[PDB]
Amino acid sequence: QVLVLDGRGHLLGRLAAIVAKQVLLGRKVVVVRCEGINISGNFYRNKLKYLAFLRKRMNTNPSRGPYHFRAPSRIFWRTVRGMLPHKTKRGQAALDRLKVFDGIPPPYDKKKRMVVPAALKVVRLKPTRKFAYLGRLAHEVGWKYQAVTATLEEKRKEKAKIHYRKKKQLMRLRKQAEKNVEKKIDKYTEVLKTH
Template identity: 80%
Template sequence: MADRFNKVLILDGRGHLLGRLAAIVAKQVLLGHKIVVVRCEGINISGNFYRNKLKYLAFLRKRMNTNPSRGPYHFRAPSRIFWRTVRGMLPHKTKRGQAALERLKVFDGIPPPYDKRGQAALERLKVFDGIPPPYDKRKRMVVPAALKIVRLKPTRRFAVLGRLAHEVGWKYQAITATLEEKRKEKAKLRYTKKKVVLKLTKQAEKNVESKIAKYTEVLKQYGVLV
């Protein structure tokens, strides 16, 4: 169980719906999982682009009238927009602890560690634009329940978070795209090399198959080989 929670789950945000992905990620980080979300600029939002842009521009106008530097703070990077969406689904300010029957604990006030559940959950979440090292060489997952192609009708309009962020002030769209192209070229070369090595490995196994047949049978009997 401990290994399951120590393992970092890497999600590829491209092609996912913003709210659905954020809801699933929020629940999982609350449960204790560590999650990294890459390619946040490829996240989709249902509804046409112009409508979503107007909504975000209206959001940008919300500020403290006398001293805007005190907040609320409006992020422009797609990764931070997604992070803020997840934060809105977490009890990052509330102080709550749960209790049940024999395991029930009651306190006057709310002592640690029960006072920082939402904050601790946010610390287990990392978000990125593009796919930086070392995550570019690791397996990435998707969340089927949040994929646009699964959840949104083909005729429905949608907006891409990267374009929306760019039009409200994000300055690194071109840089991120350039770095992504370089990453894809490196990944292509790495995969070609991997296929060659895999082919040679299979050939080597085939060459010695007859010599190690008796050992293979013994290992299969004890369940070492399947």
């Protein structure tokens, strides 16, 4: 059904390729933590290309024409727009199925986030090559919401710690229960047939 994807440590084009392929099949995919999506190359080059993209505008009326979003979620949504056939009611329905968010929403705090191995910085890039941060680029050009998103991100990280301590306590309790006795009769079946 829903595919909640991490954005921490992913690449823009690779993640956009996998999302734009999997959204045409019907799986409702949502890319969360979009401010952490890395872009290869130099950061001066990335902001120079984005400055050229801002320079591209209609001269007779800039409103009727090129729109230039500054938020990184809308940057990734434009990246998936430029790959889906959005002028037809296949890519238009796919962009209606696609949802993108900066930070993490409260349902996606609770729901588990997936990590795509094919789009990772470590898998795809040589570790001695330069990179950038899409949230850093967005804060440098236009998107003035880094200080609020980072504060709410630290808040949900504190929430995640105070949940993970309870989860690890319950895991220690259930492994004490597994350490206890009189469960091995089924384990004679299970260890033979793939414990």
